[PDB]
Design a protein around this ligand. Structure first.
Ligand SMILES: *C(=O)N1C[C@H](NOS(=O)(=O)O)CC[C@H]1C(N)=O
Length: 356
């Protein structure tokens, strides 16, 4: 039962039902990446999808943001249990005197919403938004997945090292991870590689700037670079501080059902049922506030576990999953924003074949 036939069997129903123009799949197994490419980057250009095509990975970006944050912890910028206002004096006498940096990163500050209100379109309006925000829940008790929440975490983390987020990401973290095809903004020389997204109206679309977009959803990368980042999260980085940063993202803070929330990555005990993996990625978890089952203290989660993250933009749909103990990772990048349940079912089938 060859890998190639397992991947085809899992992916073809996606390509068919969702009319996906282009998909790049990368599988890491036995210490080597394997690439499976389908379709086109741009319906109005000749270049086919390859493992070098750049896709918008949307909220998978939060795994990079989390790693920048833990890098700042390693470098002494802050501690995860610090109050947010320690690092943002403009938030003195706000909710953020009680919220911790870890709670921002884990969407548990107390009901920060999925998106900023549309009116928040500048740095000053962003600052005012956080100053004015009235919590819905006590700090730490509820998970409400939130771009403003992890966005502020990344912004403040970089500030503790005296740098803008984009600078620290592009000049320190990505180079130390040796990621040469990963961008917050795609440079001119790489534009030939940048796919277009295809919206639910079948129109070609690209992500536009937004408040804390870099932190929450802004990375463009290839399947080759993203599977390299997955590998770093399994067998490590040769940069000592980056390795400490990567390891620290495995810190779990609470659970919701069978899912444990870490920094960026969400994880499950492995073996994991398909039902549990679907539930943890479902709208009931992703787009509703859920009361958490708290941990007494944050806990490093282990190798015998499945780590994952979904992400989407207008016209793009990404999913990444890996099991460190098994040495298997899967990256699926598409230029259609197709259903998360379908991403999960396909990846689950591939994973069950490669880690029975
Ligand atoms: C992430 O890609 N963004 C935030 C949120 N992510 O939740 S998901 O991974 O379950 O899709 C919704 C989609 C997206 C966004 N529109 O900001």
């Amino acid at each position: 039962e060859p890998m190639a036939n397992i991947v085809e069997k899992a992916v073809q129903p996606l390509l068919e039902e969702y009319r996906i123009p282009g998909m790049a799949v990368a599988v890491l197994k036995e210490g080597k990446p394997h690439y499976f490419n389908y379709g086109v980057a741009n319906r109005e250009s000749g270049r086919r999808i390859s493992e070098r095509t750049l896709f918008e990975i949307g909220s998978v970006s939060k795994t990079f943001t989390a790693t920048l944050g833990t890098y700042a912890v390693v470098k002494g910028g802050f501690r995860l249990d610090d109050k947010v206002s320690q690092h943002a004096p403009w938030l003195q006498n706000s909710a953020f005197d009680r919220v911790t940096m870890a709670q921002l990163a884990t969407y548990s500050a107390g009901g920060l919403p999925l998106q900023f209100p549309d009116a928040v379109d500048s740095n000053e309006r962003m600052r005012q938004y956080y100053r004015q925000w009235s919590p819905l829940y006590a700090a730490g008790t509820h998970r409400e997945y939130s771009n403003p929440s992890i966005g502020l975490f990344g912004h403040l983390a970089a500030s503790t090292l005296g740098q803008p987020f984009r600078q620290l990401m592009s000049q320190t973290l990505l180079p130390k991870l040796d990621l040469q095809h990963t961008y917050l903004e795609v440079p001119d020389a790489a534009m030939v590689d940048y796919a277009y997204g295809y919206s639910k109206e079948d129109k070609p679309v690209r992500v536009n700037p937004g408040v804390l977009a870099d932190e929450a959803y802004g990375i463009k990368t290839s399947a080759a670079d993203l599977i390299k980042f997955v590998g770093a999260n399994m067998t490590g980085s040769g940069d000592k501080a980056v390795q400490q940063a990567l390891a620290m993202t495995r810190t779990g803070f609470y659970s919701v059902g069978e899912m444990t929330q870490g920094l960026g990555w969400e994880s499950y005990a492995y073996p994991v049922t398909e039902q549990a993996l679907l539930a943890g990625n479902s709208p009931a978890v992703s787009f509703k506030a859920n009361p958490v089952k708290p941990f007494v203290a944050p806990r490093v989660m282990g190798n015998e576990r499945l780590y994952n993250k979904t992400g989407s933009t207008n016209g793009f749909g990404a999913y990444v999953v890996f099991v460190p103990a098994r040495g298997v990772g899967i990256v699926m990048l598409a230029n259609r924003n197709y259903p998360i349940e379908a991403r999960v079912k396909a990846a689950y089938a591939i994973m069950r074949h490669l880690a029975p």
